């Protein structure tokens with residue numbers, strides 16, 4: 155008999171598990187496979203990168219990462235790979251240069267420090283980078299983490315604090331008896347609880363029907379490649395119109411990512427492998443003579459409302475939702491967990507439904 | 518040309534690589550397979566758990582003092598966390614005979630002996646509630662701990678690569694090139710690697726190369742089989758030790774249990790009887806393991822020396838030939854000082870004692 159059962163053991167559900175259990179709530183994670191089985195183990199873990207109410211949530215989440223990391227390491231033994239060596243936006247042609255200069259110029263007015271670099275000035279800092287790069291924007295405060303490690307950290311933190319983790323357990327439905335959540339119906343039987351959180355990434359749609367038929371998430375498949383190198387090829391991640399090359403602990407380079415909407419398919423097509431690597435060669439040619447390590451596919455949970463659903467059901471008491479983070483669920487995992495636990499404890503109002511899901515279209 | 522070529526990409530070779538490169542030396546590492554692919558990936562990473570005047574004793578003491586701040590240094594430099602944990606280790610007893618020998622180790626080991634104390638079976642179960650009713654008591658060592666050996670090994674080696682070392686994985690050293698009684702390089706499977714110094718750190722395979730010291734010298738593998746299970750429950754905060762057998766928790770709900778001892782074999786398969794015996798012994802110490810989740814099993818070749826002690830030092834007659842292999846069951850614990858000693862010795866800031874005693 156739990157305070158909250160959490161449906162899904164990705165970063166988002168594990169983050170929620172962490173913050174609740176930390177505050178003495180008896181919590182259960184129910185996950186149909188394993189912790190970090192899906193988007194959260196496929197993600198490149200980049201933090202930061204137009205305006206909107208997410209930008210501010212992101213900024214708030216971003217700032218939690220330094221202390222969160224230290225805490226998690228100390229408590230669980232897992233280091234999440236938090237790194238802050240900055241991130242480059244690169245440009246290889248003039249359209250791209252201007253696109254980047256314009257982003258920077260609106261960004262700068264918000265207080266975020268960033269410097270425009272010349273191709274030669276980039277190459278002083280990152281010498282393996284292509285002669286084709288003509289400029290770039292450097293953000294010294296950006297960084298990244300190891301998505302699966304952060305995920306695993308949250309979940310074991312939760313367990314240490316008393317959370318029960320049920321892997322290989324699928325939630326078919328929520329048990330609402332008198333317009334109240336009384337439990338959850340799983341493949342391994344009933345789990346009694348007083349509150350539920352839907353954190354089912356790309357699979358949340360059916361359970362989101364309790365809120366509304368049109369509420370939902372769908373998978374946007376992304377394929378990525380990883381290579382190893384004995385050279386110091388990149389110090390910091392490089393970005394180019396969503397495409398990225400990122401270092402990780404241990405001389406690993408992670409490179410992606412394709413976009414294939416509305417499929418749960420986790421195979422990798424050759425063409426994607428070829429397309430990804432050829433693009434990487436124009437940025438960073440030495441990757442030709444690196445060591446192939448792996449390739450994989452992950453399922454970004456797009457929102458039907460183009461913003462994650464984070465909130466309490468207005469009628470059915472104890473029924474919560476927290477999914478649809480799409481491309482920024484690693485970045486936002488800390489703010490999401492913190493918020494959800496505040497909301498579950500009555501410490502915050504149910505205002506993030508309103509704020510994130512309505513967009514004024516006219517006027 | 519390199520100031521030093523290091524033969525072996527284990528924790529020992531990679532320590533030496535770290536400490537050296539960190540002092541502006543140009544180092545190559547030459548490794549048959551890949552970094553940390555033998556004993557150093559297989560090890561349980563326990564620290565500290567010899568007679569009192571054995572120098573390894575002073576060395577082990579110094580190794581343990583370098584470890585905390587080294588862990589920070591490697592993390593912040595390479596981004597690799599070595600799993601340094603200092604929550605202690607319990608030497609358990611299940612017989613009254615064991616209790617005696619344990620109390621005996623404690624009493625006559627108080628060489629400022631890590632402020633260790635006796636706990637009753639009941640007081641241990643307070644501290645660790647899944648441990649067996651069968652344990653009478655144990656000696657808790659508060660300043661005892663453990664690392665993740667494969668991780669420490671990787672840290673060290675990336676540390677050196679960041680400091681300019683060239684890692685030649687997938688490269689076997691056949692022989693050491695000696696022209697005019699000085700070392701000019703190392704003859705490998707790929708090409709010739711030109712260096713002014715070499716360090717034999719080839720663990721259990723060092724024997725042929727050690728013959729340039731004395732045909733009497735050599736190392737050999739002592740096979741060890743280990744089992745790893747995963748768990749959602751909190752079965753242990755700190756490792757338990759018992760006459761070489763150990764149950765150790767690792768970050769991420771993992772529990773590695775071992776180990777077996779099969780001497781004079783390089784063979785890396787695991788015999789079912791070893792799994793059967795390790796697990797059955799484990800069940801008496803921590804019954805919940807019955808319903809944990811099986812993860813994996815493996816073997817590693819502990820590098821025993823012909824002389825039952827590491828070879829660490831410089832060749833008296835041959836200019837620039839060094840050795841540092843054969844740490845048997847303490848290779849992880851001594852990787853920091855083995856590295857620091859070896860680099861101090863190459864820079865002529867340390868005398869050549871260990872080769873004598």
Ligand SMILES: Cc1cc2nc3c(=O)[nH]c(=O)nc-3n(C[C@H](O)[C@H](O)[C@H](O)COP(=O)(O)OP(=O)(O)OC[C@H]3O[C@@H](n4cnc5c(N)ncnc54)[C@H](O)[C@@H]3O)c2cc1C
Pocket residue numbers: 161162163164165166167184185186187188189190191192193194195196197198199200201323324325326353354355356357358374375376377378410411451452453454455476477478479480481482483484485486
């Ligand atoms: C290629 C790629 C690169 C990315 N890069 C970045 C990046 O650089 N920065 C960034 O912030 N984000 C990135 N992301 C996004 C990030 O992966 C997601 O936004 C985030 O992982 C979503 O986490 P989640 O827990 O909601 O989803 P998931 O990790 O998919 O978790 C959902 C979990 O719920 C479980 N589940 C579903 N239904 C049920 C049920 N009925 N019962 C029980 N369990 C259930 C599933 O097993 C799954 O484990 C990237 C994604 C991809 C694919």
Ligand SMILES: Cc1cc2nc3c(=O)[nH]c(=O)nc-3n(C[C@H](O)[C@H](O)[C@H](O)COP(=O)(O)OP(=O)(O)OC[C@H]3O[C@@H](n4cnc5c(N)ncnc54)[C@H](O)[C@@H]3O)c2cc1C
Pocket residue numbers: 524525526527528529530547548549550551552553554555556557558559560561562563564666688689690691718719720721722723740741742743775776816817818819820842843844845846847848849850851
């Ligand atoms: C089961 C087990 C548990 C253990 N537990 C502990 C513990 O709890 N605490 C502890 O302190 N220690 C422990 N050890 C000991 C520790 O594993 C070793 O002492 C440690 O590996 C250090 O050895 P090394 O680096 O010399 O050996 P290795 O890791 O074997 O390194 C030797 C390297 O040299 C390479 N090599 C060999 N020949 C050549 C050549 N011609 N050219 C190039 N490369 C070559 C090999 O490929 C190998 O990678 C344990 C060992 C085992 C097996």
